[PDB]
Amino acid sequence: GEVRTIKVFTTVDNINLHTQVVDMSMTYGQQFGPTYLDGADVTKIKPHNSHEGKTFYVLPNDDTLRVEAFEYYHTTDPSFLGRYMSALNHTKKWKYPQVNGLTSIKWADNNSYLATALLTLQQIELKFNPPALQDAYYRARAGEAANFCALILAYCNKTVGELGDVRETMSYLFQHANLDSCKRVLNVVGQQQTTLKGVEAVMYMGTLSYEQFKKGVQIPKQATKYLVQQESPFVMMSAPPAQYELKHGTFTCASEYTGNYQCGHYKHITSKETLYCIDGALLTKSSEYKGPITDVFYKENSYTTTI
Ligand SMILES: Cc1ccc(N2C[C@H]3C[C@@H](C2)N3)cc1C(=O)NC1(c2ccc3c4c(cccc24)C(=O)N3C)CC1
Ligand SMILES: [Zn+2]
Ligand SMILES: [Zn+2]
């Protein structure tokens, strides 16, 4: 029968577009391989008249596409693009309410960890290295966060509907950020000093209190570890969830966690004119706070001990 054609664009990064002429009598998969339209898998579908001029994602199947994908995402995992598209097909349907100019996410698909991470990322100073994260983060800050959320799911190898860990999520994203100038000097009292750089310089697991880290924490005979010097724009202090008192103006933000390991619920606590509890789309305020906290973030620039 008749052979009709339309013009479309293919891409791996939505920056470099490659004009294609498509045969409407064949499926996209027969012509391109796995093919996606705004996240939806159209590999098994034939071109529709309405697809003319639209942009489709394809898997990198030639060296030009391979280079474009790597330069944009900073990954060689061949499953990455398909996982990113599968997540986007869901996150494009989430809602992203603004809370005091912070983009949150209405609860869906056990995404409380992602809303809490997204809110945190808008409150600390971070520069991503992969252009894909740079571009999507800028959009997310302005309220259009579906692509950023799908990329986070793909980078962290999380499926939509799976509850993830905020500390683990932030840690992996930090591996894609420019933290090269961050430095931490510790003394453990023999008396021994160590210097950490990069992501290890901004994370700690064992106490929520930055002040306690400065004064000294006991670690295994028992010794005292304390912070000698900190050069970073923030620090993330974490510990297994425990009841904790947060005081206005003494922290930047924090992760509240209720429930059991791997199956509970996160909320986000931030300090503004009072304490805000952002719970996806829901906001409550209170002058005081006591509750189960598992991460606290503190802004920083340069700290030097007086010990
Ligand atoms: C919410 C979530 C999602 C995923 C995961 N996972 C852990 C390992 C496996 C893969 C994914 N990776 C953990 C949590 C979780 O529940 N994470 C916290 C937690 C709760 C209760 C805890 C702990 C402890 C140590 C560290 C974290 C933690 C602990 O000792 N208890 C009793 C932050 C909430
Ligand atoms: Zn949840
Ligand atoms: Zn000792």
Side-chain angles (χ1 to χ4, degrees), residues 82-136:
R83 285 182 299 100
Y84 165 40
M85 292 284 111
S86 307
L88 183 60
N89 199 44
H90 291 95
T91 66
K92 71 194 194 180
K93 306 179 188 195
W94 293 350
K95 296 342 190 93
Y96 299 94
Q98 295 287 129
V99 185
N100 204 255
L102 290 167
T103 309
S104 194
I105 323 173
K106 183 197 185 157
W107 191 92
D109 302 312
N110 297 309
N111 74 358
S112 64
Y113 76 107
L114 284 171
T116 301
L118 174 59
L119 290 160
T120 300
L121 287 157
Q122 287 165 97
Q123 293 176 72
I124 61 177
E125 190 161 290
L126 200 67
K127 178 83 218 141
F128 288 112
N129 292 325
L133 286 173
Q134 293 173 6
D135 294 346

Side-chain angles (χ1 to χ4, degrees), residues 158 163-165 167-168 205 240-241 257 260-262 266 294:
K158 296 301 198 210
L163 182 63
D165 176 301
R167 180 185 69 108
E168 295 185 359
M205 188 49 177
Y257 186 82
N260 281 54
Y261 190 69
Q262 291 191 268
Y266 281 101
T294 190

Side-chain angles (χ1 to χ4, degrees), residues 283-297:
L283 174 62
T284 58
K285 291 184 198 200
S286 60
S287 46
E288 316 272 20
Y289 178 94
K290 287 190 206 183
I293 298 300
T294 190
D295 312 294
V296 185
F297 298 77

Side-chain angles (χ1 to χ4, degrees), residues 24-220 222-289:
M24 312 197 54
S25 80
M26 298 163 65
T27 68
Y28 285 108
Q30 284 169 331
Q31 301 178 74
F32 299 154
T35 305
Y36 306 83
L37 185 56
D38 207 21
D41 188 343
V42 305
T43 312
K44 310 310 208 83
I45 263 64
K46 296 207 180 154
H48 186 232
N49 291 324
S50 69
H51 295 162
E52 174 133 61
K54 290 198 175 354
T55 294
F56 294 77
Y57 281 74
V58 291
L59 299 189
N61 82 325
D62 57 51
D63 278 7
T64 305
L65 288 178
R66 274 180 217 115
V67 174
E68 283 170 357
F70 180 71
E71 285 183 358
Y72 197 61
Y73 302 111
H74 292 189
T75 185
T76 36
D77 181 352
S79 75
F80 182 88
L81 249 172
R83 285 182 299 100
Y84 165 40
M85 292 284 111
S86 307
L88 183 60
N89 199 44
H90 291 95
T91 66
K92 71 194 194 180
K93 306 179 188 195
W94 293 350
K95 296 342 190 93
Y96 299 94
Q98 295 287 129
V99 185
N100 204 255
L102 290 167
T103 309
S104 194
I105 323 173
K106 183 197 185 157
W107 191 92
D109 302 312
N110 297 309
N111 74 358
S112 64
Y113 76 107
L114 284 171
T116 301
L118 174 59
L119 290 160
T120 300
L121 287 157
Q122 287 165 97
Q123 293 176 72
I124 61 177
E125 190 161 290
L126 200 67
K127 178 83 218 141
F128 288 112
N129 292 325
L133 286 173
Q134 293 173 6
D135 294 346
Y137 181 34
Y138 179 91
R139 287 200 50 181
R141 292 189 92 129
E144 274 177 339
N147 275 94
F148 194 50
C149 289
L151 281 171
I152 290 162
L153 290 156
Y155 278 110
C156 296
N157 268 284
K158 296 301 198 210
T159 87
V160 171
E162 175 179 15
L163 182 63
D165 176 301
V166 167
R167 180 185 69 108
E168 295 185 359
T169 302
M170 297 298 285
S171 180
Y172 196 72
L173 297 177
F174 289 167
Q175 305 241 71
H176 283 282
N178 183 357
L179 294 174
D180 294 341
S181 87
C182 294
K183 185 167 79 153
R184 167 170 285 163
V185 180
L186 300 170
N187 191 28
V188 174
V189 313
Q191 180 138 322
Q192 179 188 99
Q193 182 185 280
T194 291
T195 294
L196 306 172
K197 297 253 254 165
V199 176
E200 292 196 318
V202 304
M203 291 181 335
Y204 188 79
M205 188 49 177
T207 188
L208 297 175
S209 174
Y210 193 28
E211 293 308 301
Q212 190 63 72
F213 198 39
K214 291 165 176 186
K215 277 189 208 143
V217 298
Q218 260 71 233
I219 52 148
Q222 283 223 112
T224 306
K225 164 185 278 172
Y226 66 96
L227 182 61
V228 172
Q229 177 71 46
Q230 183 74 33
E231 292 177 19
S232 58
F234 64 89
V235 298
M236 170 174 85
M237 314 284 302
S238 302
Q243 195 80 345
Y244 198 82
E245 185 173 12
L246 293 169
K247 302 246 64 153
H248 171 247
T250 70
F251 70 105
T252 299
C253 59
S255 303
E256 176 192 284
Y257 186 82
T258 59
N260 281 54
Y261 190 69
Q262 291 191 268
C263 54
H265 183 70
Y266 281 101
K267 295 184 204 177
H268 179 86
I269 315 300
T270 182
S271 179
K272 295 294 155 253
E273 84 283 353
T274 192
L275 305 176
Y276 292 20
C277 175
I278 307 175
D279 183 7
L282 324 179
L283 174 62
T284 58
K285 291 184 198 200
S286 60
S287 46
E288 316 272 20
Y289 178 94

